[PDB]
């Protein structure tokens, strides 16, 4: 509490629209979460709300465990995690309704 950790999900291919990012993603995606943290379902006005919070908290928690371990997430990383963690939070909000 107040957060909960969801079960792990299979990684989607995600196409980012440019040759450089697709390659970048494929090479760095192992560094990103494959499961999400969230607050209970009865604490949000909607999906959009849940998802916003699930994405921020998760990247923050994920960013903290990686830094202790050294290394950093860059802006592309941060950009790509949001997209993919967003996808994941959405599947999770669905598993609840």
């Amino acid at each position, epitope marked *: 509490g107040g957060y909960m950790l969801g079960s792990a999900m299979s990684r989607p*291919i995600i*196409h*980012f*629209g*440019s*040759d*450089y*990012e*697709d390659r970048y993603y494929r090479e760095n995606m192992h560094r990103y979460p494959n499961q999400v943290y969230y607050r209970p379902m009865d604490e949000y006005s909607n999906q959009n709300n849940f998802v916003h919070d699930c994405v921020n908290i998760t990247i923050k928690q994920h960013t903290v465990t990686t830094t202790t371990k050294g290394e950093n997430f860059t802006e592309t990383d941060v950009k790509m995690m949001e*997209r993919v963690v*967003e*996808q994941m939070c959405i599947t999770q909000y669905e598993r609840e309704s």
Partner: antibody
Amino acid sequence: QVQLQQSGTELVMPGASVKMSCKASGYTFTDYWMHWVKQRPGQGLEWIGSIDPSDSYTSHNEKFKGKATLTVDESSSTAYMQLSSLTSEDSAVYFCSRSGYGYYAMEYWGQGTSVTVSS
Amino acid sequence: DIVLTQSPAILSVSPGERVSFSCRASQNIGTSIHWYQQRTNESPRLIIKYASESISGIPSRFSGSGSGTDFTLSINSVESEDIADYYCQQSNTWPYTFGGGTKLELKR
């Protein structure tokens, strides 16, 4: 056979918005990025923005960011681009196009919606 | 932004002749350049992808070569239906950019 269907023409008042449609068929809609390209009369191509129908993630030409809103309707295999606050600068043909799978040459092109801005 | 420069802006050619035009990028893009043909009052059409890969249903007389910053499209035997504008475009990084086009014309 892949098709991308665009309305031929739109007459829109200066200051008004227009929402142009691009309806895809003959393939799996969510598997390919769709792109929108502007061409002013007698001039070259200009990229506006692109969208991944799978999650509606978008990329824009910086100068269209705030001007062109890209969406899809997954239920109807349709991509839409809305232009708001039209001026004579917006009179042009707008093509939609579809790239390959994880590759970004524009493989299929719509016939273009010719937009005329006039009072 | 990667700026793509095409030259010449207009080229006059005689039928059956072999012709070429070039697309040069301000930064290295590997092979991430594509070529389109646009005849008067038509949509553009993909002619070569990724510098050199041929496209289904496009005549084998079209070819492209190059890698890095300097790219060339060549047409082995120009036919009247090839008279059109040709644009290059990159997809290596955002924003996508297009060359300004090379217009093909018939010598008379």
